[PDB]
Coordinates of C-alpha atoms and ligand atoms in Angstrom, one line a residue:
Chain A
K1 CA -9.9 100.7 -46.9
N2 CA -10.3 100.3 -43.2
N3 CA -13.9 99.8 -44.2
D4 CA -16.0 96.8 -43.0
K5 CA -18.9 96.2 -45.4
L6 CA -20.1 93.3 -43.2
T7 CA -21.3 95.6 -40.3
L8 CA -24.0 98.3 -40.5
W9 CA -24.4 100.3 -37.3
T10 CA -25.2 103.5 -35.4
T11 CA -21.6 103.5 -34.0
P12 CA -21.1 101.8 -30.6
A13 CA -21.4 105.2 -28.7
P14 CA -24.0 107.3 -30.6
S15 CA -25.0 110.9 -30.0
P16 CA -28.8 111.4 -29.8
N17 CA -30.0 109.9 -33.1
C18 CA -33.7 108.9 -32.9
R19 CA -37.2 110.0 -32.2
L20 CA -39.4 108.1 -29.7
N21 CA -41.7 111.1 -29.0
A22 CA -39.6 114.1 -30.4
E23 CA -36.5 114.5 -32.6
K24 CA -33.2 113.2 -31.0
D25 CA -34.9 112.4 -27.7
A26 CA -33.0 109.0 -27.5
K27 CA -29.7 107.2 -28.3
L28 CA -30.4 104.0 -30.2
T29 CA -27.4 101.6 -30.3
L30 CA -28.2 99.1 -33.1
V31 CA -25.5 96.9 -34.7
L32 CA -26.2 94.6 -37.7
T33 CA -23.5 92.0 -38.5
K34 CA -23.9 90.0 -41.7
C35 CA -23.3 86.2 -41.2
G36 CA -24.2 85.1 -44.8
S37 CA -27.9 84.2 -44.8
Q38 CA -28.6 85.6 -41.3
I39 CA -28.1 89.0 -39.7
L40 CA -26.8 88.9 -36.1
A41 CA -28.1 92.0 -34.2
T42 CA -27.7 93.7 -30.9
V43 CA -30.0 96.6 -29.7
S44 CA -30.2 98.9 -26.7
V45 CA -31.9 102.3 -26.2
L46 CA -31.4 105.2 -23.8
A47 CA -33.8 108.2 -23.6
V48 CA -32.1 111.6 -23.0
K49 CA -35.1 114.1 -22.9
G50 CA -38.9 114.3 -22.6
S51 CA -41.5 112.1 -21.0
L52 CA -39.1 109.0 -20.9
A53 CA -36.2 110.9 -19.2
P54 CA -37.5 110.3 -16.7
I55 CA -40.6 108.2 -17.2
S56 CA -43.5 110.5 -16.2
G57 CA -47.3 110.2 -15.8
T58 CA -49.0 107.3 -17.5
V59 CA -46.5 106.2 -20.2
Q60 CA -46.0 102.5 -20.3
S61 CA -44.5 101.9 -23.7
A62 CA -42.1 103.3 -26.4
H63 CA -42.0 102.6 -30.2
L64 CA -39.6 103.1 -33.0
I65 CA -40.2 102.1 -36.6
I66 CA -37.2 102.2 -39.1
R67 CA -38.2 102.1 -42.8
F68 CA -35.9 101.5 -45.8
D69 CA -36.3 101.8 -49.6
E70 CA -35.6 99.1 -52.2
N71 CA -31.8 99.8 -51.9
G72 CA -31.9 99.4 -48.1
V73 CA -31.5 103.2 -47.7
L74 CA -33.4 105.0 -44.9
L75 CA -36.5 106.9 -46.2
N76 CA -36.9 110.6 -46.0
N77 CA -38.4 111.7 -42.6
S78 CA -36.8 108.7 -40.9
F79 CA -37.2 108.5 -37.1
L80 CA -33.6 107.2 -37.1
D81 CA -31.3 110.0 -38.2
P82 CA -29.3 109.0 -41.3
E83 CA -26.0 111.0 -40.6
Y84 CA -24.4 108.2 -38.4
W85 CA -26.1 105.1 -39.8
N86 CA -23.5 103.5 -42.1
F87 CA -20.9 100.8 -42.6
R88 CA -18.2 100.4 -39.9
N89 CA -14.8 102.2 -40.0
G90 CA -13.0 101.4 -36.6
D91 CA -15.4 102.7 -33.9
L92 CA -16.9 105.2 -36.4
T93 CA -19.0 105.2 -39.5
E94 CA -18.0 105.9 -43.1
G95 CA -18.7 109.6 -43.9
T96 CA -20.1 109.0 -47.4
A97 CA -23.7 107.7 -47.4
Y98 CA -24.1 104.1 -48.5
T99 CA -26.0 103.5 -51.8
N100 CA -26.9 99.8 -51.1
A101 CA -27.5 97.6 -48.0
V102 CA -30.0 95.1 -49.4
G103 CA -27.9 92.2 -47.8
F104 CA -28.9 93.6 -44.3
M105 CA -32.6 93.9 -45.0
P106 CA -35.1 91.4 -43.6
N107 CA -36.0 88.7 -46.2
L108 CA -39.4 89.3 -47.9
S109 CA -40.1 85.6 -48.5
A110 CA -39.7 84.9 -44.7
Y111 CA -41.3 88.2 -43.5
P112 CA -43.8 89.5 -46.2
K113 CA -44.8 93.2 -46.4
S114 CA -48.5 92.7 -45.2
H115 CA -47.6 90.0 -42.5
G116 CA -46.7 91.9 -39.3
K117 CA -49.4 90.1 -37.3
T118 CA -47.9 86.7 -38.4
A119 CA -46.0 85.0 -35.6
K120 CA -42.9 84.3 -37.7
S121 CA -42.4 88.1 -38.4
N122 CA -42.1 88.8 -34.6
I123 CA -39.3 88.3 -32.1
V124 CA -40.5 88.8 -28.6
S125 CA -38.6 88.7 -25.3
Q126 CA -38.0 90.4 -22.0
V127 CA -35.3 93.1 -21.6
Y128 CA -34.6 94.8 -18.3
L129 CA -34.7 98.5 -17.3
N130 CA -31.3 99.8 -16.1
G131 CA -30.0 96.1 -16.5
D132 CA -32.0 95.4 -13.3
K133 CA -33.5 91.8 -13.2
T134 CA -36.5 93.2 -11.0
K135 CA -37.6 95.7 -13.8
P136 CA -38.7 93.7 -16.8
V137 CA -39.8 95.4 -20.1
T138 CA -41.2 93.4 -23.0
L139 CA -39.5 94.0 -26.4
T140 CA -41.4 93.1 -29.6
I141 CA -39.4 93.3 -32.9
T142 CA -41.4 93.1 -36.0
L143 CA -39.8 92.6 -39.5
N144 CA -41.4 94.2 -42.6
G145 CA -44.6 95.1 -40.7
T146 CA -46.3 96.3 -37.5
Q147 CA -48.7 95.0 -34.9
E148 CA -50.0 98.3 -33.3
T149 CA -52.7 100.7 -34.5
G150 CA -52.5 100.1 -38.3
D151 CA -49.5 100.5 -40.8
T152 CA -49.8 100.3 -44.7
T153 CA -47.1 103.0 -44.7
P154 CA -45.0 102.7 -47.9
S155 CA -41.5 101.2 -47.5
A156 CA -39.7 98.2 -49.2
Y157 CA -38.4 96.9 -45.8
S158 CA -38.8 97.8 -42.1
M159 CA -37.7 97.0 -38.6
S160 CA -40.1 97.9 -35.7
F161 CA -39.1 98.0 -32.0
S162 CA -41.9 98.2 -29.3
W163 CA -41.0 98.3 -25.6
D164 CA -43.9 97.8 -23.2
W165 CA -44.1 97.7 -19.4
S166 CA -47.9 97.5 -18.9
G167 CA -48.7 97.0 -15.2
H168 CA -45.3 98.3 -13.9
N169 CA -44.7 101.7 -12.1
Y170 CA -41.3 102.9 -13.4
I171 CA -42.1 106.6 -12.8
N172 CA -38.9 108.7 -12.1
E173 CA -36.6 106.1 -13.8
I174 CA -34.8 106.9 -17.0
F175 CA -36.0 104.7 -19.9
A176 CA -32.8 102.6 -20.6
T177 CA -32.7 99.0 -21.7
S178 CA -30.3 96.1 -21.3
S179 CA -28.7 94.9 -24.5
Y180 CA -30.6 92.3 -26.5
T181 CA -29.3 89.8 -29.1
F182 CA -31.4 88.6 -32.1
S183 CA -31.1 87.3 -35.6
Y184 CA -33.2 87.3 -38.8
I185 CA -33.1 85.8 -42.3
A186 CA -31.4 88.2 -44.8
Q187 CA -32.9 89.3 -48.1
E188 CA -29.6 88.4 -50.0
Chain B
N1 CA -25.5 78.9 -53.9
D2 CA -24.4 78.8 -50.3
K3 CA -22.9 75.8 -48.4
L4 CA -22.8 77.8 -45.2
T5 CA -26.6 77.8 -44.7
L6 CA -28.7 74.6 -44.3
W7 CA -32.5 75.5 -44.2
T8 CA -36.1 74.5 -44.8
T9 CA -36.3 77.5 -47.2
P10 CA -37.6 80.8 -45.7
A11 CA -41.3 80.2 -46.8
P12 CA -41.8 76.4 -46.6
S13 CA -44.9 74.4 -47.5
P14 CA -46.2 72.0 -44.8
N15 CA -43.1 70.0 -44.0
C16 CA -43.4 68.4 -40.6
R17 CA -45.4 66.0 -38.4
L18 CA -46.4 67.2 -34.9
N19 CA -49.5 64.9 -34.6
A20 CA -49.9 63.8 -38.2
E21 CA -47.9 64.1 -41.5
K22 CA -47.6 67.7 -42.9
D23 CA -49.7 69.2 -40.1
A24 CA -47.3 72.1 -39.7
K25 CA -44.8 74.4 -41.3
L26 CA -41.4 74.5 -39.6
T27 CA -39.1 77.3 -40.6
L28 CA -35.6 76.4 -39.4
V29 CA -32.4 78.1 -40.6
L30 CA -28.9 77.0 -39.6
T31 CA -26.0 79.3 -40.5
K32 CA -22.4 78.1 -39.9
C33 CA -20.2 80.6 -38.1
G34 CA -17.2 78.4 -37.7
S35 CA -17.3 76.5 -34.4
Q36 CA -20.9 77.7 -33.6
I37 CA -24.1 77.4 -35.5
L38 CA -26.5 80.4 -35.5
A39 CA -30.1 79.3 -35.7
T40 CA -33.6 80.8 -36.1
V41 CA -36.8 78.7 -35.6
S42 CA -40.6 79.3 -35.9
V43 CA -43.5 76.9 -36.3
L44 CA -47.1 77.3 -37.7
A45 CA -49.7 74.5 -37.4
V46 CA -52.0 74.2 -40.5
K47 CA -54.3 71.3 -39.6
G48 CA -55.5 69.0 -36.7
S49 CA -55.7 69.6 -32.9
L50 CA -53.2 72.6 -33.0
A51 CA -55.1 74.4 -35.8
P52 CA -56.9 75.5 -33.8
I53 CA -55.8 74.4 -30.4
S54 CA -58.5 72.1 -29.1
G55 CA -59.4 70.1 -26.0
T56 CA -56.7 69.5 -23.5
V57 CA -53.7 70.1 -25.9
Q58 CA -51.0 72.2 -23.9
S59 CA -47.9 71.1 -25.8
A60 CA -46.3 70.2 -29.2
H61 CA -43.1 68.2 -29.9
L62 CA -40.8 67.5 -32.8
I63 CA -37.6 65.4 -32.9
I64 CA -35.2 65.7 -36.0
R65 CA -32.7 62.8 -36.4
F66 CA -29.6 62.6 -38.5
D67 CA -27.1 59.9 -39.5
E68 CA -23.3 60.1 -39.1
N69 CA -23.0 62.2 -42.3
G70 CA -25.6 64.7 -41.0
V71 CA -28.3 63.4 -43.5
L72 CA -31.9 63.0 -42.3
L73 CA -32.9 59.4 -41.3
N74 CA -35.6 57.6 -43.1
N75 CA -39.1 58.0 -41.5
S76 CA -38.2 61.6 -40.7
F77 CA -40.8 63.8 -39.0
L78 CA -39.2 66.7 -41.0
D79 CA -39.8 66.1 -44.7
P80 CA -36.4 65.9 -46.5
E81 CA -37.6 67.3 -49.9
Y82 CA -36.8 71.0 -49.1
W83 CA -34.2 70.5 -46.4
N84 CA -30.9 71.5 -48.1
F85 CA -28.2 74.1 -48.6
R86 CA -29.3 77.5 -49.7
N87 CA -29.7 78.7 -53.4
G88 CA -31.4 82.2 -53.4
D89 CA -34.7 81.8 -51.4
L90 CA -34.8 78.1 -52.4
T91 CA -32.7 74.9 -51.9
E92 CA -30.1 73.4 -54.1
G93 CA -31.7 70.7 -56.3
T94 CA -29.3 67.8 -55.6
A95 CA -29.7 66.3 -52.1
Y96 CA -26.7 66.9 -49.8
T97 CA -24.4 64.0 -48.8
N98 CA -22.5 65.7 -45.9
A99 CA -23.6 68.3 -43.2
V100 CA -21.5 67.1 -40.3
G101 CA -20.3 70.8 -39.8
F102 CA -23.9 71.7 -38.9
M103 CA -24.4 68.9 -36.3
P104 CA -24.4 69.5 -32.5
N105 CA -21.0 68.7 -31.1
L106 CA -21.0 65.2 -29.4
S107 CA -18.3 66.2 -26.8
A108 CA -20.5 69.2 -25.7
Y109 CA -23.8 67.4 -26.0
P110 CA -23.2 63.6 -25.7
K111 CA -25.7 61.2 -27.3
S112 CA -28.7 60.4 -24.9
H113 CA -27.5 63.0 -22.3
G114 CA -30.7 65.0 -22.8
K115 CA -31.4 65.3 -19.1
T116 CA -28.0 67.2 -18.7
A117 CA -28.6 70.9 -18.3
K118 CA -25.9 71.9 -20.9
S119 CA -27.7 69.9 -23.7
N120 CA -30.8 72.1 -23.3
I121 CA -31.6 75.6 -24.4
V122 CA -34.8 76.9 -22.7
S123 CA -36.7 80.2 -23.3
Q124 CA -40.1 81.8 -23.7
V125 CA -41.6 82.4 -27.2
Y126 CA -44.9 84.0 -27.8
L127 CA -48.1 82.7 -29.5
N128 CA -48.9 84.8 -32.6
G129 CA -46.1 87.2 -31.6
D130 CA -48.3 88.4 -28.7
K131 CA -46.4 89.3 -25.5
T132 CA -49.5 88.3 -23.3
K133 CA -49.4 84.6 -24.6
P134 CA -46.1 83.0 -23.5
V135 CA -45.1 79.4 -24.6
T136 CA -42.0 77.7 -23.2
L137 CA -39.6 76.3 -25.8
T138 CA -37.1 73.6 -24.8
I139 CA -34.5 72.7 -27.4
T140 CA -32.5 69.5 -26.7
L141 CA -29.3 68.6 -28.6
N142 CA -28.4 64.9 -29.2
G143 CA -31.1 63.8 -26.7
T144 CA -34.6 64.3 -25.3
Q145 CA -35.7 65.9 -22.1
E146 CA -37.3 62.7 -21.0
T147 CA -36.4 59.0 -20.8
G148 CA -35.0 57.2 -24.0
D149 CA -36.1 58.0 -27.4
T150 CA -35.1 54.5 -28.5
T151 CA -34.9 55.3 -32.3
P152 CA -31.1 55.2 -33.0
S153 CA -29.4 58.3 -34.6
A154 CA -25.9 59.8 -34.7
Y155 CA -27.2 63.3 -34.0
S156 CA -30.5 64.9 -33.1
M157 CA -32.3 68.2 -32.4
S158 CA -35.6 68.1 -30.3
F159 CA -38.1 71.0 -30.0
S160 CA -40.7 71.0 -27.2
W161 CA -43.3 73.8 -26.9
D162 CA -45.3 73.8 -23.7
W163 CA -48.0 76.2 -22.3
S164 CA -49.2 74.3 -19.2
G165 CA -51.6 76.5 -17.2
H166 CA -52.7 78.7 -20.2
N167 CA -56.0 78.5 -22.1
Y168 CA -55.2 79.1 -25.8
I169 CA -58.2 77.0 -27.0
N170 CA -59.4 78.3 -30.5
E171 CA -56.1 80.0 -31.3
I172 CA -53.9 78.7 -34.1
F173 CA -50.6 77.3 -32.8
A174 CA -47.9 79.7 -34.2
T175 CA -44.7 80.9 -32.5
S176 CA -42.6 84.0 -32.5
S177 CA -39.2 83.6 -34.2
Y178 CA -36.4 82.5 -31.7
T179 CA -32.7 82.8 -32.1
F180 CA -30.2 80.3 -30.5
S181 CA -26.7 79.0 -31.1
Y182 CA -24.9 75.7 -30.3
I183 CA -21.3 74.3 -30.6
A184 CA -20.7 72.5 -34.0
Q185 CA -19.3 69.0 -34.4
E186 CA -16.6 70.2 -36.9
Chain C
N1 CA -5.9 75.9 -35.5
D2 CA -9.1 77.9 -35.6
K3 CA -8.2 81.5 -34.6
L4 CA -11.9 82.6 -34.9
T5 CA -13.0 80.6 -31.7
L6 CA -11.7 81.2 -28.2
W7 CA -13.1 78.6 -25.7
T8 CA -12.8 76.5 -22.6
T9 CA -13.1 73.4 -24.7
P10 CA -16.6 71.9 -25.2
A11 CA -16.2 69.3 -22.3
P12 CA -14.0 71.1 -19.7
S13 CA -12.6 69.7 -16.5
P14 CA -13.3 71.8 -13.4
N15 CA -11.9 75.2 -14.3
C16 CA -13.5 78.0 -12.3
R17 CA -14.1 79.4 -8.9
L18 CA -17.6 80.3 -7.7
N19 CA -16.9 79.8 -4.0
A20 CA -13.5 77.9 -4.1
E21 CA -10.9 77.1 -6.8
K22 CA -12.1 74.5 -9.4
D23 CA -15.6 74.1 -7.7
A24 CA -17.3 74.4 -11.2
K25 CA -17.1 73.6 -14.9
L26 CA -17.7 76.7 -17.0
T27 CA -18.4 76.0 -20.7
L28 CA -17.8 79.4 -22.5
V29 CA -17.3 79.6 -26.3
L30 CA -16.6 82.9 -28.1
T31 CA -16.9 82.9 -31.9
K32 CA -15.8 86.0 -33.8
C33 CA -18.3 87.2 -36.4
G34 CA -16.3 90.4 -37.4
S35 CA -17.7 93.3 -35.3
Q36 CA -19.7 91.1 -32.9
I37 CA -18.8 88.1 -30.8
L38 CA -21.3 85.2 -30.7
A39 CA -21.2 83.5 -27.3
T40 CA -22.7 80.4 -25.6
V41 CA -22.3 79.8 -21.8
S42 CA -23.3 77.0 -19.4
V43 CA -22.1 76.2 -15.8
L44 CA -22.1 73.1 -13.7
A45 CA -21.0 73.0 -10.0
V46 CA -19.0 70.0 -8.9
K47 CA -18.3 70.6 -5.1
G48 CA -19.2 72.9 -2.2
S49 CA -22.4 74.8 -1.3
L50 CA -23.7 74.7 -4.9
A51 CA -23.2 70.9 -5.3
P52 CA -25.8 70.5 -4.1
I53 CA -27.4 73.9 -3.3
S54 CA -27.5 74.1 0.5
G55 CA -28.8 76.4 3.2
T56 CA -29.5 80.0 2.3
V57 CA -27.6 80.0 -1.2
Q58 CA -29.7 81.8 -3.8
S59 CA -27.0 83.2 -6.1
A60 CA -23.6 82.5 -7.8
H61 CA -21.1 85.0 -9.2
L62 CA -18.0 84.9 -11.5
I63 CA -15.9 87.8 -12.8
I64 CA -13.3 87.1 -15.6
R65 CA -10.7 89.8 -16.2
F66 CA -8.2 90.4 -19.0
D67 CA -5.2 92.7 -19.6
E68 CA -4.7 95.1 -22.6
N69 CA -3.7 92.1 -24.8
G70 CA -6.9 90.2 -24.0
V71 CA -4.9 87.7 -21.8
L72 CA -6.3 86.4 -18.4
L73 CA -4.9 88.2 -15.4
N74 CA -2.9 86.5 -12.7
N75 CA -5.2 85.2 -9.8
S76 CA -7.9 84.5 -12.5
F77 CA -11.1 82.8 -11.2
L78 CA -11.2 81.1 -14.7
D79 CA -8.2 78.8 -15.0
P80 CA -5.9 79.8 -17.9
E81 CA -4.6 76.3 -18.7
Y82 CA -7.5 75.3 -21.1
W83 CA -8.6 78.8 -22.2
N84 CA -7.3 79.1 -25.8
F85 CA -8.0 79.0 -29.5
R86 CA -9.7 76.0 -30.9
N87 CA -7.9 72.9 -32.2
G88 CA -10.5 70.1 -32.9
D89 CA -12.4 69.6 -29.6
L90 CA -9.3 70.8 -27.7
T91 CA -7.2 73.9 -27.2
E92 CA -3.9 74.9 -28.6
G93 CA -1.1 74.0 -26.0
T94 CA 0.9 77.2 -26.4
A95 CA -0.7 80.2 -24.6
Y96 CA -2.2 82.9 -26.8
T97 CA -0.5 86.3 -26.7
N98 CA -3.3 88.4 -28.2
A99 CA -7.2 88.1 -28.2
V100 CA -8.1 91.8 -28.4
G101 CA -10.6 90.9 -31.2
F102 CA -12.7 89.0 -28.7
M103 CA -12.8 91.7 -25.9
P104 CA -15.9 93.7 -25.2
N105 CA -15.7 97.1 -27.0
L106 CA -14.7 100.0 -24.7
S107 CA -16.7 102.6 -26.5
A108 CA -19.9 100.6 -26.3
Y109 CA -19.2 99.3 -22.7
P110 CA -16.9 101.8 -20.9
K111 CA -14.6 100.5 -18.1
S112 CA -16.4 100.6 -14.7
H113 CA -19.9 101.6 -16.3
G114 CA -21.4 98.3 -15.0
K115 CA -24.5 100.1 -13.7
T116 CA -25.2 101.4 -17.3
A117 CA -28.1 99.5 -18.9
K118 CA -26.3 98.9 -22.2
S119 CA -23.4 97.1 -20.5
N120 CA -25.8 94.4 -19.2
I121 CA -27.4 91.4 -20.9
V122 CA -30.2 89.9 -18.7
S123 CA -32.3 86.8 -19.3
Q124 CA -33.7 83.7 -17.7
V125 CA -31.9 80.4 -17.9
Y126 CA -33.3 77.1 -16.3
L127 CA -31.9 74.8 -13.7
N128 CA -31.2 71.3 -15.1
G129 CA -32.8 72.5 -18.4
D130 CA -36.2 72.4 -16.5
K131 CA -38.7 75.1 -17.6
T132 CA -40.3 75.1 -14.1
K133 CA -36.9 76.2 -12.5
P134 CA -35.9 79.7 -13.7
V135 CA -32.6 81.4 -12.7
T136 CA -31.9 85.0 -13.8
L137 CA -28.5 85.4 -15.5
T138 CA -27.0 89.0 -15.6
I139 CA -23.9 89.4 -17.9
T140 CA -22.0 92.6 -17.4
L141 CA -19.3 93.8 -20.0
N142 CA -16.3 95.8 -18.7
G143 CA -17.9 96.3 -15.3
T144 CA -20.0 94.6 -12.5
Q145 CA -23.8 95.2 -11.9
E146 CA -22.9 94.9 -8.2
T147 CA -20.8 98.1 -8.1
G148 CA -17.1 98.8 -7.8
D149 CA -15.0 95.7 -8.5
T150 CA -11.8 97.4 -7.3
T151 CA -9.3 95.0 -9.1
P152 CA -7.9 96.9 -12.2
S153 CA -8.2 95.2 -15.6
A154 CA -8.4 96.5 -19.2
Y155 CA -11.5 94.3 -20.0
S156 CA -13.9 92.1 -18.0
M157 CA -16.9 89.8 -18.4
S158 CA -19.1 89.2 -15.2
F159 CA -21.7 86.4 -14.8
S160 CA -24.3 86.6 -12.0
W161 CA -26.9 83.9 -11.5
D162 CA -29.7 84.6 -9.1
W163 CA -32.8 82.6 -8.0
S164 CA -34.2 84.8 -5.2
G165 CA -37.5 83.5 -4.0
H166 CA -37.0 79.9 -5.2
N167 CA -36.2 76.8 -3.1
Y168 CA -33.7 74.7 -5.1
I169 CA -32.2 73.0 -2.0
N170 CA -30.6 69.6 -2.7
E171 CA -30.4 70.3 -6.5
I172 CA -27.0 70.5 -8.2
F173 CA -26.4 74.1 -9.6
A174 CA -26.4 73.4 -13.4
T175 CA -27.8 75.8 -16.1
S176 CA -29.3 75.5 -19.5
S177 CA -27.0 76.8 -22.3
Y178 CA -27.6 80.5 -23.2
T179 CA -26.7 82.4 -26.4
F180 CA -25.7 86.1 -26.4
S181 CA -23.6 88.6 -28.5
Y182 CA -21.7 91.8 -27.9
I183 CA -19.7 94.4 -29.8
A184 CA -16.0 93.5 -30.3
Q185 CA -13.2 95.9 -29.5
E186 CA -11.5 95.4 -32.9
Ligands
MG1 MG1 -38.3 85.1 -20.1

């Protein structure tokens, strides 16, 4: 059992695995590492096709919402593909889908279902396009909720990533973000 | 039951004093990862001049002080009732007698060396989780980013929120969650 | 011993080269949390053109390089004497022979892909812990954001501090503490 039940990830070098505008138009690298009562996370994203590859016209943001059921399992019609979202085995994922990941879900006491507009449910910081300090992008992570254009979409748990560069002209650049570290309180 | 997390609980009642007793809810979670502590912090004001922000208020400050065993001092500006080791989403019932493993390391962050760069963690957080409303957070370990706090303590953690130059009048003072780490005493 | 933390010690003597040998004190602590390393970094210059900042100086750079076993190369710009696994507030005296579990993952951060966004962590730190004195810190894993470091290594970690546009002349170069994490090789 080369398994590691304390890390849930996309793999460190994913194939296209998520939908920012269309199916598999980006590679999300997301690693969740369980440190008891807190999850330690790293996230980065790279667009591979469409209006973010390269950034065209008037687009100044990108959004991904990941939704899980009561067992911490991705919902049907997930915008993150489930095939390579699993517990760690070396640099790969287990092949058999997990049945329970509640230990990696954002705590519902800390981050209640209807509370996405609450300050505590948001982690907000700058990341940098192409790892370039002169090209800031704001990242807003929302736990068990959304601040955007209205979400009472059923899920038990959720994690929302919103990248925004209002005011910046990044036309003809590929949308790709520096790696960002964060933590949140675990459900169990 | 979990002796590797010391917290306020994830959903505290008013539990700290920014300008008067119990005028805010501090959510502070400390998770021991051996030689480093992994921490998350958020604050929400519930009454007074921060709820909502009034007049000329452009900052808020909290100092938490501990004794040599890592126990909150008397006259604490963080209420000790629900500051304890984790049990579910609650605290253990019996007050802890030792948390030295969660205290900021005195070799790394010496007592009253708060003006030293290394004893400070400084970053932007965001009012109401709103990217257009930045607030600077300065965290100081075993000191204050200022001349002497003269109340003795073995260890301390100081939080200073500042929004000089911004007009947030009539907004409730509430901060996005912020992750940091620091070197543990043992 | 504590084989889950690799560090400079929490209060190092001068131990790294920004512009000359031992012209700075780097505090760097790496704590293994399975698949991720939790890190804290701070730097303090002690002599030369950064102590205090003089003339035209608006940046500082350090590259740390390791072999296939995770051991510092010869001609290291971080001194190997006090870079080791934790023993109290000190280091083990006998040099480590393997630290591959602390190295940046090659699948995530491929060798010489320093211009790739994912291999960079970028944020503001603050001179003297002062919120009015920002400094950008760019961390690069297994590469350098300034291209083509030509010195071969199995693994590397690059730190670039930049304050273009700011006049910090006559200040000592000293940074607030900064937390980050990265995917571990094993
Ligand atoms: Mg910033």
